[PDB]
Amino acid sequence: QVRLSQSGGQMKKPGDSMRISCRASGYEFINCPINWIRLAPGKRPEWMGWMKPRLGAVSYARQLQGRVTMTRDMYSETAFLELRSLTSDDTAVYFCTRGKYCTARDYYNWDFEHWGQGTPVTVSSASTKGPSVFPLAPSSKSTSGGTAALGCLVKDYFPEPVTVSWNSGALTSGVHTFPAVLQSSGLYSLSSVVTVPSSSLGTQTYICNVNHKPSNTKVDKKVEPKSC
Amino acid sequence: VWKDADTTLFCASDAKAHETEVHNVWATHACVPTDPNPQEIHLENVTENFNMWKNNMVEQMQEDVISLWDQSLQPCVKLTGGSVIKQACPKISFDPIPIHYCTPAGYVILKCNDKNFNGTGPCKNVSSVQCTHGIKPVVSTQLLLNGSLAEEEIIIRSENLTNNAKTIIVHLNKSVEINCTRPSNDIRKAYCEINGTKWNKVLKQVTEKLKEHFNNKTIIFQPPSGGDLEITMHHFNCRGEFFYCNTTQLFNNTCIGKGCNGTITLPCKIKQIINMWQGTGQAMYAPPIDGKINCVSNITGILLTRDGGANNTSNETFRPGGGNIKDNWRSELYKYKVVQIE
Amino acid sequence: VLTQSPGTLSLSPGETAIISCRTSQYGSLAWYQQRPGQAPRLVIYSGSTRAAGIPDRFSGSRWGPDYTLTISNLESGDFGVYYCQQYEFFGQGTKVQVDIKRTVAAPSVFIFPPSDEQLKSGTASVVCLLNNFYPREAKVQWKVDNALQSGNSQESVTEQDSKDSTYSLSSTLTLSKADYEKHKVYACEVTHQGLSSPVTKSFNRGEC
Ligand SMILES: *[C@@H]1O[C@H](CO)[C@@H](O)[C@H](O)[C@H]1NC(C)=O
Ligand SMILES: *[C@@H]1O[C@H](CO)[C@@H](O)[C@H](O)[C@H]1NC(C)=O
Ligand SMILES: *[C@@H]1O[C@H](CO)[C@@H](O)[C@H](O)[C@H]1NC(C)=O
Ligand SMILES: *[C@@H]1O[C@H](CO)[C@@H](O)[C@H](O)[C@H]1NC(C)=O
Ligand SMILES: *[C@@H]1O[C@H](CO)[C@@H](O)[C@H](O)[C@H]1NC(C)=O
Ligand SMILES: *[C@@H]1O[C@H](CO)[C@@H](O)[C@H](O)[C@H]1NC(C)=O
Ligand SMILES: *[C@@H]1O[C@H](CO)[C@@H](O)[C@H](O)[C@H]1NC(C)=O
Numbered sequence A: 001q002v003r004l005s006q007s008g009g010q011m012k013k014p015g016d017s018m019r020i021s022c023r024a025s026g027y028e029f030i031n032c033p034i035n036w037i038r039l040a041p042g043k044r045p046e047w048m049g050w051m052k053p054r055l056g057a058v059s060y061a062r063q064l065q066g067r068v069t070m071t072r073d074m075y076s077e078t079a080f081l082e083l084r085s086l087t088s089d090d091t092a093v094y095f096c097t098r099g100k101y102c103t104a105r106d107y108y109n110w111d112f113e114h115w116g117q118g119t120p121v122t123v124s125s126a127s128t129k130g131p132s133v134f135p136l137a138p139s140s141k142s143t144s145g146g147t148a149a150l151g152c153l154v155k156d157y158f159p160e161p162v163t164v165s166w167n168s169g170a171l172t173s174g175v176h177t178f179p180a181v182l183q184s185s186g187l188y189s190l191s192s193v194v195t196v197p198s199s200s201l202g203t204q205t206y207i208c209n210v211n212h213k214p215s216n217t218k219v220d221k222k223v224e225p226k227s228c
Numbered sequence B: 001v002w003k004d005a006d007t008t009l010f011c012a013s014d015a016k017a018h019e020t021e022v023h024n025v026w027a028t029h030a031c032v033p034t035d036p037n038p039q040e041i042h043l044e045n046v047t048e049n050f051n052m053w054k055n056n057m058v059e060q061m062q063e064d065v066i067s068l069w070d071q072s073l074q075p076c077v078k079l080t081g082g083s084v085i086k087q088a089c090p091k092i093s094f095d096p097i098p099i100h101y102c103t104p105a106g107y108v109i110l111k112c113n114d115k116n117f118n119g120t121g122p123c124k125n126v127s128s129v130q131c132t133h134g135i136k137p138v139v140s141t142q143l144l145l146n147g148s149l150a151e152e153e154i155i156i157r158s159e160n161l162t163n164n165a166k167t168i169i170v171h172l173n174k175s176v177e178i179n180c181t182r183p184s185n186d187i188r189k190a191y192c193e194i195n196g197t198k199w200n201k202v203l204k205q206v207t208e209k210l211k212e213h214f215n216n217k218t219i220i221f222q223p224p225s226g227g228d229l230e231i232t233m234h235h236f237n238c239r240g241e242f243f244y245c246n247t248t249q250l251f252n253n254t255c256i257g258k259g260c261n262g263t264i265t266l267p268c269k270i271k272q273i274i275n276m277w278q279g280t281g282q283a284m285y286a287p288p289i290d291g292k293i294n295c296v297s298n299i300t301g302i303l304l305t306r307d308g309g310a311n312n313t314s315n316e317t318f319r320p321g322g323g324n325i326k327d328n329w330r331s332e333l334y335k336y337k338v339v340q341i342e
Numbered sequence C: 001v002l003t004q005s006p007g008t009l010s011l012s013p014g015e016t017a018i019i020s021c022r023t024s025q026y027g028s029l030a031w032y033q034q035r036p037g038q039a040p041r042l043v044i045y046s047g048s049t050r051a052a053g054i055p056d057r058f059s060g061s062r063w064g065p066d067y068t069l070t071i072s073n074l075e076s077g078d079f080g081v082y083y084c085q086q087y088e089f090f091g092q093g094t095k096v097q098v099d100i101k102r103t104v105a106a107p108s109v110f111i112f113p114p115s116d117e118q119l120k121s122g123t124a125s126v127v128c129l130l131n132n133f134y135p136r137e138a139k140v141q142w143k144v145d146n147a148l149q150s151g152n153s154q155e156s157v158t159e160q161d162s163k164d165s166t167y168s169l170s171s172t173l174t175l176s177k178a179d180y181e182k183h184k185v186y187a188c189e190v191t192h193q194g195l196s197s198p199v200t201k202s203f204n205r206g207e208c
């Protein structure tokens, strides 16, 4: 039975290099090429290249030329991947794979029946940045039979995660804390909102409590209607 | 009425039983005398399909060449499977002779005669023969040496050009000589000479052919991406010695795009410790013989791989390939297929 | 060269999933399934041939350049993300996630002008909230002085609520302070099945 076993996950910094292994068993190693595919949440699966064990012939994806190296050890039947000049864009789960059809006389590379279990690699800066907390003000006029939405915008922080509570956790009903988005600047941002009766806008105080453990940051922000 | 079939072919040659040369000795015991009066029958109103990449003739030739090399080029030490085999390693006389492959009774070889035939697909001009032409079992990588030339234009051959895992065979219609020499009086150091004028003109024709297959994209050559020396360099056996030549200069994009003219000299080296192309492992041979070791060969083809990847740029990149010696045999057996009569 | 659609598919167990891939090149097309936290698995190769262990509930088809993976009678182990492939190329992926069915609920739309605290930072974020709607499928378009916006907006969606089985969506429009002070009308238009007509919430900069 064909098996591919990969080395453990790791965390790297921008500028570093990474190396990962894929041990193969259950078939004649030299008969079939081995491929490396990486998976990142949000993006297309990316074929990085293949490596034919017999004489180590390789073919690297264009956009990775010069950064990637694929070798192998015949005796231990292990394939190896190296990627240099790591950036945030290299954060992904790395797989080694081999095609379904593989005989001593012929193969087809691209129907990937066989997959390693995957090797998660995180590339990120050791720097941390505290969030900005801006009030998302309800409105101007108070209504005595309608519901009001309010919240706070938690902007430009790194890395994940931030958590948000309201009124030190006393307010939970109608609260929505949205998954963070990654901005173009490389910094994260999210929103937390809550719907409340509009008649309680001049009576109850609404504080959002933002927590960002990596930057050791705890911020309370009162969200009140703009005086005009 | 016939049909495509597979059988055990017999070999024929013009070997000499008085010759101490390795290919001759093998062929004497493995093959029969050749036919002075061959017979070829051109078939009218007949259209047959061919596929050089699924031609089982290639498999048999492979076994033969492996047997030939194993019975002859015996190492001093054989390093495979974590074990060590110490044998005797005397120097030998080595010079590949032509080998004809032939069909037994009930079978016959169909031959494609279309001048622009690319290796796969239908063939209009088909003839019937009992034996192939004389094929030299030349083992090499990157460059195809001493082979037969294409009749008309340069022919691009691939099982599937859109599949970057499939080898491309470029079949030349005008040979270019490569003159490799290990001088007398580092004994392992050698060099190859090529006429830059001839080569760069052929290479330019190669890119224009490639343009026809790749939508007039800019065609770019690059050194191999990696691998063992046997494939990152032009690997071949001359007079018994294993040569490794650095072909970086052979694929100079500047010259196919002043001064490039002249005699190109590729740096070579003779290794005594090699990786076997038979997929076996590391073999160890004695030091080279004294005196001028030289061989002049026809470059008759090129082995290439094409870069892939989620790109969008206006250019295709090609790199010298090889390693699968079965491809060497395909490049000569491409116009042949075995059929069974009833 | 490979265009997979849709991006997200929200279905209940027992229903059928229809995933399509448009190609421009020609070669054998494969389909893969990735369950959460697990390695991708080969489902279909060569267009419609079922891999080992794959139930006849999975079937591939092709009309012209469009290849389709249909999954009948969705089971728990069928949900996840699916990818089509040709040679080294892969589709964007189709996320198939569990949806619990309920009555259609239109969203309550709210818009929030940039904070005055933030406007001292040179950046201006406008937030549009879509609250408690069903089904998940919803479109949000930003308009600035009645001009459609592209490439300056980010959206985030909650997981289906465990109690009321609704979704909420947050869209953020980010402009420079200079660019923000340039225009007057800022609006987010919301189209959803629970609305008989697209609904637009807007404010005029400066006035309260
Ligand atoms: C060779 O010709 C056949 C027949 O038309 C065609 O199907 C195939 O694509 C061609 N191959 C190359 C490499 O041009
Ligand atoms: C090399 O090519 C020349 C003509 O280009 C030919 O005369 C000669 O026989 C060839 N040598 C071989 C095929 O060994
Ligand atoms: C070889 O083929 C090329 C086209 O690929 C052609 O331009 C050239 O004239 C040919 N050389 C011959 C037939 O000697
Ligand atoms: C090959 O090159 C050597 C010099 O290295 C030269 O003496 C010899 O004449 C050349 N042979 C041919 C056939 O050109
Ligand atoms: C290279 O070949 C050309 C003919 O193609 C010939 O005229 C020229 O003299 C050769 N160059 C050298 C340095 O021998
Ligand atoms: C071949 O020679 C070139 C000379 O420019 C060099 O850059 C390259 O590294 C050499 N290749 C190997 C495998 O040593
Ligand atoms: C090619 O053939 C010539 C004679 O025709 C011979 O001298 C030379 O060694 C051969 N080259 C190879 C690589 O076998």
Ligand SMILES: *[C@@H]1O[C@H](CO)[C@@H](O)[C@H](O)[C@H]1NC(C)=O
Pocket: B120, B159, B160, C026, C027, C028
């Ligand atoms: C090329 O490969 C595809 C599958 O990837 C196959 O359907 C097609 O028949 C192949 N073409 C040739 C000419 O072999």
